[PDB]
Amino acid sequence: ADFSLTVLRARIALLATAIGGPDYTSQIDPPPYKLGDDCLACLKDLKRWFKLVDDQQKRWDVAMAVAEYRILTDDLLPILIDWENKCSLAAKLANKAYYDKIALNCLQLLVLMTWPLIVTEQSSSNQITLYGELKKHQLVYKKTILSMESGKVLRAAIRLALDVIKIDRLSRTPRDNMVLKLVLNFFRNVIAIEPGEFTINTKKSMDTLPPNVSMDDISLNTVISSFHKNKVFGFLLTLTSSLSKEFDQDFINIPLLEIMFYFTKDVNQELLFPRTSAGFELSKLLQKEHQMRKNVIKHTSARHSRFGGLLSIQTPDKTRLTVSGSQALVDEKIALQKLDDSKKWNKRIIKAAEGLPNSLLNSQTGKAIFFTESNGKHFKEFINNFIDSGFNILLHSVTNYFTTEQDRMVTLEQVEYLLFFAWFVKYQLLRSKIDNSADIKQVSEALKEVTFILVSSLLRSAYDLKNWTVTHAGMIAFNELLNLVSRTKAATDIEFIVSRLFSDERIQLLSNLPKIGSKYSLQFMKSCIELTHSVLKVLEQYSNFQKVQANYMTEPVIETYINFLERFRELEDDSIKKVFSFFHRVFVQAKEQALLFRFDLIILLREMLSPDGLDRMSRSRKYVSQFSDYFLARLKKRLKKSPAWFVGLLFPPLHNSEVGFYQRY
Amino acid sequence: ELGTSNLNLDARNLLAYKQTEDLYHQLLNYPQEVISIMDQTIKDCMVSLIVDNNLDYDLDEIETKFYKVRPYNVGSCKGMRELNPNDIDKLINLKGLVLRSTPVIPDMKVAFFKCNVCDHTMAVEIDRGVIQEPARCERIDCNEPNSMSLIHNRCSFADKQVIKLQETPDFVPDGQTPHSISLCVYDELVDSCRAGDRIEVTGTFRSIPIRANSRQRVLKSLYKTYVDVVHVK
């Protein structure tokens, strides 16, 4: 009942005051907190309220109670910080066990409350009700934990780890090792908490940061600063690098994978290399803004909106239409476009991924996250030292784990592995592209046979069961493996690895992939395109080729390519170069001209080539115009040789045996 | 070379040149279309001069500007009381004295929309006084209804003013008092004229309906009338 609920809440409040309180004799305005008694029982009973009650009933009500009475912000952090500062001063000089016990049992609650949130169709209605509000409260937790004394509570957690680093592995009991797992499990939650995702019941078709929280509190930039001042990056760097020497690999390496995923996620690598500067590029952007303003002006009438006359346009067969506006009097192109624009109907439209926080898989990554100069150099230093020190040893251990455990996997671990691989391989390739001080040998563990088999197996199993998110992530990873191979061949076993990478079964799979992409989100099709480009280029430099290329060329691939290309206003300069490379391959080299004689391509070249779309001076227009000239030349030749293609241009090609062969050629 | 935008044109020159003898009548009978044709002709000619003579002037600057013709000396002046319903939408010439002018009124020309959920934005053209609001947000992944909304202070506006012109005493009927007519004037010609000025004007003689009430589309049978000036002398 409500009264039972409030009785438990009042019990939690009385436990939130039995804990202790500061001293009013102190004359120190204010002093620190001061300690109560029965507090072991208080912390233990609170732990029981989480585990023995809330988990068994699947509520999150207990968390709502502790959030109501603000236990984390008010008691746990000053208890831990007082313990840390007392022991710190004692170390400067250079029943106490009970102090240490209270430190441990406070940290465990800190891990529990900030634990990340999952919602399914099997979660209770209570949890589904309480999801949106506990998100707000956990955002408050992240801000408060990073704020206090410029984040000093994080030093306590690594001191607890240092107690278990201290003495030899040969002595270290299982309960001892649980501490070393716990301290990293803390940092994963502190990184993972981020602004909420809005969710509603789909009953009818019709921000969540609380008033005390803002973006700069919650941004990753703040986390980089807070971590550096409180001495975390040294702890992670020294722990990962010496992992090979008899730290029991089983307890550490998956959480230590999760951290590296959880702040590589929202960075583009170009932002970390530069390739008054800010003001200069701002001025250039203002020039671009002026160009857009000019585009609007060129469609703007001189005289006012009620001055306008009326226009009549007569067709062949002497039928007449009517359009208004002054610009229609002079511009027939605008009149024709405006005539069709009035019509009401649009055909309604069809729509792939869920259950995972935001990442490259389901967001447009043409949007950076922004760094201070100190933060930029500190983050660069951290991941550079990580790559030069820790990458190979970590990947060897985690990959020779998963081969023995692939059957038992969950979707999180697959997507984590595949997006850790990709990020670090790509970053090393770009850094060695830039400068000679870097080398490619730092990431060379990816190529050895076991990891190649595992990435292949993940992609295989994901594709067969039609799990499309893991298929996407495996696509990204397999792309980076092929890119790295093309790097190393430009310098023995790598050709053996290529020959095993391009057995006929894999050619069947990799040829199958772009065809299904037509239905899915924009990112899927882009991944398919870039993978296809790399795949075909590697087999170009193998010297089989004619068999493989004919496997790719058919209608559904071209459909995907055109469906992707018509959203060019959102895309990069580079992707269009890739698309027109493929169109050059189809049209000129292979001489399979008949595929592209289809009408929705002819509309696209008008839209993209007009003064509307692609800029007059962007590099794209060179490629586009140079393609369209040849396209219309060959089309002229074909149409005059056989006038039947006028009706042909609307429809797909015709698959009948007796007429189809002459149709295609 | 002086960086100016408006060209005078006394209509009698159209009668001198043989190819434009009929264009003179078409100007009087169909002002709204013909004047627009003349404007777009002038702008294209200005571009053609710099590109053909290959001069140093910025093409973008000339493309940005608006150019307008302003015809005058159209014909015989017409008495204010003698304008009849068969003169609607034809060019007219009047003489009179200025009584008063209202302050400048802002007149909207372009609307600005913003999506509430995804922050997509669109600029929309105003014609015939009606804002053509989109039905759904046009971003591909945010195809939702009722999702766009107007932002007032990011629209684009233009100046309008109303001038009250009085009949000169030379035309008043015997044993009667003079009448007055209202002129609507835009942009360049807004603040030209003061109380007590004596002027001659040239403009289209328009008429429009007026509503019975502000709640509904019910119109009255009688129509308001006014003049839409394009030149003042």
Partner: peptide, 11 residues
């Protein structure tokens, strides 16, 4: 219940 996240919300 037909719970649903605003997957398309990215601004």
């Amino acid at each position: 219940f037909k719970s649903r996240a605003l997957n398309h919300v990215k601004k």
